[PDB]
Structure 1
């Protein structure tokens, strides 16, 4: 399955079956498993959507006066990708989906006629288009479910039901907006066909994602890993132990990565050359890709490094987390510990001797939401300033922010490790205000401030 022979073909022992069942059981309480009723409800919602897509495309087809041997056979289908597709959807998160339509349907139609169709559907509320983004998307809450819809116009007269979007010939000549909108599905579909046992893969991913979250290292934006990245690490682990079940896979996961020789890239398959002029991660021909610290490459063309935002600080943090994970699973395997110990959250607010507290405020909840989103995307800047400081070894940003007239304030806690800081944090705040204003995304009285604190005096700035 992988690009290398597996490390071991051994299958589990009954001992492991029982350990795998216990793992499943310590997970339920965490809501890791979506409720079946909800899963059924999502399934029925998607079906309705898919029918709305077919309806719409059919309609466009007629207005373009195509023949009936075609109008009747023109397809149209919605494809789900990402987490919900992997079967490890994060309760509270949306459902990502790609609307695949034939040649005769333009993107303009998507944001016009299709958009107006969703507008007049009883279940549709909060309909909002963002057709000017990197990946054009139509967002909406469909019967209480949050959904993101991307559009892709393929060079086909009809969209056959069995269409497999992995086919690299489908991207040829397409507009980049169309190409980008296809990446999610292709990556997801590649992953699923790149693992020896979907089920075992699924359960392991569930565990790993929870683990990363409980350990404050789950965030693509902040330099750690996102869902897709975690999925690829688990998959590589699965390729290596093809007959193992979740129990040993979670353990192997830690053995394998706590010892990974970075920046050697994690690949799910051998990359193939494809003209297309699309950006491809490849240190052999792109000197800039040689600076990536923890490369985890997506398997679909154009292969890209899903973790180029990793810095010395985050990688270091994650390496240490992997080692502790290995240690815990070791004793879980010896029965000297229970699975609950893996998902136990270390007091982030107590593992470092020094911290930086980041405060973001706004005059209204709407703005606090926007503002916080902006500042979050700026935090890596500070982490960068900190690393370039002789006195600092690493900065660990706890990715889970939390609540601090009618105050509307949020705050982050950053862990520091030393080998005073006022200039760097002051520098950071000025940059945040400056960029946010230069990019016309600043509102009066939106505030951001940071203060260095010693572990001992963090208490007074928390609940």
Structure 2
């Protein structure tokens, strides 16, 4: 079997489950979780073009280096997709994450020079932008309407074989960290796909779980909840425990298993192996720092990492309760006492808590609003953190989805966004003011602050939350 433990059950579905699974599929369609076939075809064609461009570019580099016409004919090179698109659960509007793999004689500087310029002159390319200095260097672009994220890695091979498998740990041998980092995404996705007993059953279940998570305000890695990869690993673990089950049963078991999971026990998809390389590896036995993590979900490819180290007491507590409510609803569905539509109902967040904090961010232009909001979102856990230190707080629940905030100046156009944070109690002006000052200070010291960029927060009872949003 798959996984580090024996499965819970090997039982196959009954015709009863088959019909329940078909109903799940019908309930999901209206939400747009299934991309249209025509769009899927368009994306396939886009990838074919990119792949040929990569091959063409590498051939040119090979020739310009007077390499023997011997190698030139077989240097190869290709694009490897990873992430949501590769797992097949991407939704309308999602980008395509791809890794350009080239032989050793192709340098990173070439990727950002000759390849970049090749893309620049393609008719289908718009908004071409390079981010060479990021943790993971990338070239971003809009290709025929589809957003593409392209990473780069030059392997210690003279030629790139078509059957090259990136899961081989030896490939990381003494490579620059930028290359190692650029390879992790493809390796994690490929590992996941080879760690579940049935890919189709796994896929449908994940589509369901991701929609459920978003609809229940717990979808966001940045804010301390779970991101796409983390949800995929939890679904994968569930699949390993019920190898012959189909989607309707797997969705139900997903809530059974995780609502009862004993955190901080880690979620592992396979047994980790020890590798000589000196890369960061999550392991509480040898790293005391990892012992503090509250809800560990470990990536399966070396070097393994905790995909959810941002989880705090508040977010974990919120998600545990959501898993329990999810289980209850699926129990009803299995008894035909409720429809799948009830599981995807997005409760009114603006009513589940007695107290809230409203966070406002604004800028002089729409362009600056976008940049500002990104910066502020990355700091919100600082406020949550300080709130958890407050003797009167049980938890703070940040609704990951922000939205346009009401007007303030009726005479001029405004570019303002807002977040709503739910609170649970066992004066918050000092903690809020302290967080406000910190955001301004860090932004300014980072050279990422523009005049007139504002941020303000207020505490308000549920009843008065009414008079502060459309």
Q: Render the CA deviation track for 1:314-363: whole Å, top value 9, x for unaligned.
A: 00000000000000000000000000000000100000000000000000
- Counterpart CA distance in 1 for 2:341 and 2:51 is 40
Unaligned runs of 5+ in 2: 406-411
2-structure distance, mates of 1:90, 1:98? 20
Partner Cα distance (2:452, 2:83) in 1: 37
Cα distance in 1 between the residues matched to 2:69 and 2:447: 50
Residues 125-175 of structure 1: per-residue CA shift (max 9 Å, x gap)? 100000000000000000000000000010000010110000000000100
Matched, 1:316 2:317: yes
What is the CA-CA distance between 1:101 and the residue it aligns to?
Answer: 0.3
2: CA distance, partners of 1:351 / 1:90: 28
Which whole-Å CA distance do the structure 2 matches of 1:60 and 1:75 have between them?
12
Cα-to-partner distance string for 1:47-82 (whole Å, 9 max, x where unaligned) = 000000000000000001111221010011000000
Secondary structure of the corresponding residue to residue 458 of structure 1:
helix
Cα distance in 1 for residues equivalent to 2:466 and 2:80: 47
Aligned partners of 1:150 and 1:354: how far apart in 2?
Answer: 44
Measure the CA separation in 1 of the matches of 2:269 and 2:312: 23
- Paired with 1:266 and 1:75, the residues of 2 have a C-alpha distance of 38
**1:419 equivalent in structure 2:** 426
Distance 1:35 1:372 in 2: 32
In structure 1, the residue corresponding to 2:159 is in which secondary structure? coil
Deviations along 1:387-444, one digit per CA (max 9) or x if unpaired, are 0001000000000000011100000000000000000010001000000000000000
CA deviation string 1:204-263 (max 9, x = no partner): 000000000000000000000000000000000000000000000000000000000000
* Equivalent-residue separation in structure 2 for 1:259 and 1:92 (angstroms): 34
CA RMSD, 1 decimal: 0.4
Structure 1 unaligned runs (5+)?
none
User: Is the partner of 1:157 in helix, strand or coil?
Assistant: coil
SS at the partner of 1:156?
coil
Partners in 1 of 2:27 and 2:460 — Cα distance?
36
Q: Hey, what's the Cα distance between the residues in 2 that align with 1:399 and 1:110? A: 35
Moved over 2 A (4+): none
Displacement of 1:93 in angstroms is 1.8
Q: Structure 1, residues 6-43: CA drift from partner, whole Å, max 9, x if none?
A: 00000000000000000001000000000000000000
- Rounded to whole Å, the distance in 1 between the matches of 2:320 and 2:299 is 21
For 2:453, which of 446, 449, 452 is the aligned residue? 446
Looking at structure 2, the residues matched to 189 and 330 of structure 1 have their Cα atoms a distance apart, in angstroms, of 33
Q: Whole-Å Cα distance in 2 between the matches of residues 11 and 305 of structure 1? A: 32
**Alpha-carbon separation, structure 1, partners of 2:92 and 2:389:** 38
| Distance in 2 separating the partners of 1:229 and 1:133 | 22
Q: Is 2:181 the partner of 1:180?
A: yes
CA distance in 2, matches of 1:167, 1:67: 28
Q: How many residues align?
A: 463
Offset, 1:91: 1.8
**TM-score, L = length of structure 1:** 1.00
Tell me which residue corresponds to 1:145: 146
Shift of 1:192: 0.1
Give distance in 1, aligned partners of 2:300 and 2:377: 28
Mapped to 1, the partners of 2:181 and 2:283 lie a distance apart of: 19
The alpha-carbon deviation at position 90 of structure 1 amounts to: 2.7
Secondary structure of the residue that 2:385 maps to in structure 1?
helix
Give the Å deviation of 1:304: 0.1
Q: How does 1:23-38 map to 2 (within 5 A)?
A: 23-38=24-39
Distance 2:413 2:140 in 1: 29
- Separation in 1, partners of 2:351, 2:420: 11
Shift of 1:451: 0.1
Deviations 1:176-224 (A, max 9, x none): 0000000000000000000000000000000000000000000000000
Distance 2:246 2:40 in 1: 24
